[PDB]
Amino acid sequence: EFAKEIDVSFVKIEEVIGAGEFGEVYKGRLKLPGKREIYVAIKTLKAGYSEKQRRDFLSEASIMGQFDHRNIIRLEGVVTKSRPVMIITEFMENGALDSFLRQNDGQFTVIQLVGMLRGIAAGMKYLSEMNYVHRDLAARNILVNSNLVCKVSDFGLSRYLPTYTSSPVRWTAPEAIAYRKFTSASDVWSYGIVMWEVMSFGERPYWDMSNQDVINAIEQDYRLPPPMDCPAALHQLMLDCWQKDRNSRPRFAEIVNTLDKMIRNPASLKTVA
Ligand SMILES: O=C(CCl)Nc1ccc2c(Nc3cc(O)ccc3Cl)ncnc2c1
């Protein structure tokens, strides 16, 4: 049973706004009894789905429904007791962060980009302190609203932990590639990659290098260079997230504190590499 179960009559499905693993993402309208109608995004599961597909689809809604944070995509409702099965979230006008930035190259100031990163780190602090590992933290899995508020999304690979031993290569920590051992520290590595994506206006990490080239480079202690005009302190935070020893990486609480100090100390963001 889902606390956020909604009657199907409450949702009105409009245009397709994206694609998902199990089906399309649509823009829609949600009308809860005695409440003003809101715009929503709707994840659907294509007709003729297998029982495994349904279970996997809904496991995302189960993880999501456990979260209530500004920087974690809000679950507005789920449809499981009726057809079609749906996951209904708050509408994010600007979609995925990586493509939003590529389509808006040089549109935002360093402080605006830092504000976006602070929100992601706050969402990840909450997620990790709820004892979860995301395992798929990438700018493409971050959604952006009209006011540049960034929210962690795509909880399919998320796991309750403190290590998750498995049975997204250029975003994955080297120990997680080598041993299939995922922790909050391996999510911190992914976060460092997201920082690089944001300060690069959505450039692909490691550019045209193959997954194999990335694995080899990381093993040879290569680290991505600072993006154009990136403050030294922000690239240093990226390098801290990318320490070989996972225990040496900052925790998400520290990352938030660091970004909060930069936002308040303009001199800290006033020196390039
Ligand atoms: O408006 C645009 C133009 Cl790119 N795109 C989108 C695409 C997907 C969206 C989205 N997806 C989503 C993600 C999940 O992890 C679970 C459920 C859903 Cl519905 N949620 C909110 N807003 C969106 C906006």
Side-chain angles (χ1 to χ4, degrees), residues 34-47:
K35 302 243 280 152
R36 319 99 261 166
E37 195 184 70
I38 59 160
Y39 282 116
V40 284
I42 309 155
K43 251 193 191 181
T44 53
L45 175 68
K46 292 169 149 174

Side-chain angles (χ1 to χ4, degrees), residues 17 25 41-43 60 89-93 95 143 153-154:
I17 59 171
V25 183
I42 309 155
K43 251 193 191 181
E60 193 197 1
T89 66
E90 62 183 304
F91 176 65
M92 303 290 284
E93 213 217 326
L143 294 168
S153 175
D154 215 296

